[PDB]
């Protein structure tokens, strides 16, 4: 469960991401597809080449849902109900993949935000991405 300082750590780190959210989400996707090619099985309709507009577009979407989760950190299951339904009843992504995307987002943030990615903030981002993932797979069966 996210503690107060965790929420504080996440709001601040995400705060600094700012207008670069979309770019980072796309980068994290690209890192995931290259590092973990099994994740590509979920996107056979996408052009997966470097810098493709589908990845960019999707990167923005993910990044925006994350902003919404940070803004709604105290009430995630409710702010994400529609995405949770979407992943459970339509997309049906195996849960292991959420850990691969979460790791790639961390690597992306660590790379863009050196001063801000302290040991304690790393800890908090990891718990946050983990909670978001739990929320997104909670209606699976």
């Amino acid at each position: 469960v996210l503690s107060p300082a965790d929420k504080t750590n996440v709001k601040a780190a995400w705060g600094k991401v700012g207008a670069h959210a979309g770019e980072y989400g796309a980068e994290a996707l690209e890192r995931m597809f290259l590092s973990f090619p099994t994740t590509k099985t979920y996107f056979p309709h996408f052009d997966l080449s470097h810098g493709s507009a589908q990845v960019k577009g999707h990167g923005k979407k993910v990044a925006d849902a994350l902003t919404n989760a940070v803004a709604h950190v105290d009430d995630m299951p409710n702010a994400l109900s529609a995405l949770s339904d979407l992943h459970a009843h339509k997309l049906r992504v195996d849960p292991v993949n959420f850990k691969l995307l979460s790791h790639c987002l961390l690597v992306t943030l660590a790379a863009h935000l050196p001063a801000e990615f302290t040991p304690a903030v790393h800890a908090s981002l990891d718990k946050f991405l983990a909670s978001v993932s739990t929320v997104l797979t909670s209606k699976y069966r």
Partner: protein, 146 residues
């Protein structure tokens, strides 16, 4: 795939008593009932809304038979699982887009079906040898993903 001769004998001995058609149907059907997310790949199979609909669905039964037949053929080539399944691996990746994690779920469901059919005879040591075999098959089916 480090199998010892006594593991290999245990696996082969038991498999000789398996009706692949029937076990194939039980395993595929249980996969779809216990891990409903795996139904994403079989929408052309019709009604999968309840357990009886899945278990008695003739298309599930026919596909189960096909899956387990390929698996049997692999038990006859334990020393070259990768070569044996190479073309199937490519197929599952490039044409069917199946996340290989699903092969691990089926493996474990199959082990529950084997225990269910054989009771006592599926001892801890026999199960351990089958766990190595299902992991080996899953690894071989994932080997050509790119």
């Amino acid at each position: 795939m480090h199998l010892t001769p006594e593991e290999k004998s245990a696996v082969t001995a038991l498999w000789g008593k398996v009706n692949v058609d029937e076990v194939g149907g039980e395993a595929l059907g249980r996969l779809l009932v216990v891990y409903p997310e795996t139904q994403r790949f079989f929408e052309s199979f019709g009604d999968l809304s309840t357990p009886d609909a899945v278990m008695g669905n003739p298309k599930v039964k026919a596909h189960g038979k096909k899956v387990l037949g390929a698996f049997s053929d692999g038990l006859a080539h334990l020393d070259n699982l990768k070569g044996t399944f190479a073309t199937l691996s490519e197929l599952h990746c490039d044409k069917l887009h199946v996340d290989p994690e699903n092969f691990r779920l089926l493996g474990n469901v199959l082990v529950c079906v084997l225990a269910h059919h054989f009771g006592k005879e599926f001892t801890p040591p026999v199960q351990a040898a089958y766990q190595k075999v299902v992991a080996g098959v899953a690894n071989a089916l994932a080997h050509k993903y790119h």
